[PDB]
């Protein structure tokens, strides 16, 4: 579904959506397309352990440096462990081979409950497949096909879902708006969103590379 979101981004970037006489972004908004999940907080500790993150439902997960993952549901007890090959195991916090990974999940659980800003905090199962950082953004790929790109300098964020063929844009003032990508070609959009959609394309290419 990376290839699907590639064709979706190419289709809108090819229409030059900011280069229109009278742009009308608002006609492309579709609340029904709003994503169920996104990343609300993250901590890059990949020099030692991996990357820890929270999802908007307050569940937490870690993508460990050995490409395994541990996910703790928002009931604080139910666990999922994901091996490198993708094998999924259902655990509870309460096997012994994972005691080291669980005690690191706890560090990240403690961190997320107390420390960072919740992206999308106003608004009311997948795991981090992979991620990377560039000089200007962190790029997060979830197992449900969503791709999230957070931009460091101005805190804007894109959430791309290839299933709804939609993009959610969170701007610097934290305005959360979701758009059908097909309708962005029709009605156009501002230069700031069109720039980030061009960036997303180079980032999905890299995800595909």
């Amino acid at each position: 579904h990376l290839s699907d979101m590639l064709q979706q981004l190419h289709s809108v970037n090819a229409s030059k959506p900011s280069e229109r006489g009278l742009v009308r972004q608002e006609e492309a908004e579709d609340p029904a397309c709003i994503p169920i999940f996104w990343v609300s907080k993250w901590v890059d500790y990949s020099d030692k352990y991996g990357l820890g993150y929270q999802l908007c439902d307050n569940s937490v997960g870690v993508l460990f440096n050995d490409s395994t993952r541990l996910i703790l549901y928002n009931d604080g007890d139910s666990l999922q462990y994901i091996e490198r090959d993708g094998t999924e195991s259902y655990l509870t916090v309460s096997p012994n081979s994972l005691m080291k990974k669980i005690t690191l999940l706890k560090y990240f659980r403690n961190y997320m409950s107390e420390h960072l800003l919740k992206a999308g905090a106003n608004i009311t199962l997948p795991y981090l497949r992979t991620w990377f950082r560039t000089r200007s953004a962190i790029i997060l790929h979830l197992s449900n096909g969503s791709v999230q790109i957070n931009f460091f300098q101005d805190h804007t964020k894109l959430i791309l879902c290839p299933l709804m063929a939609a993009v959610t844009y969170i701007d610097e003032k934290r305005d959360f708006r979701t758009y059908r990508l097909s309708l962005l070609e029709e009605y156009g959009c501002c230069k700031e969103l069109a720039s980030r959609l061009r960036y997303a394309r180079t980032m999905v290419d890299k995800l595909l590379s």
């Binding site: 990343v39 993250w42 890059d44 500790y45 990949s46 020099d47 960072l116 800003l117 805190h155």
Partner: peptide
Amino acid sequence: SMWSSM
């Protein structure tokens, strides 16, 4: 290291 917004 690095972290999301504080």
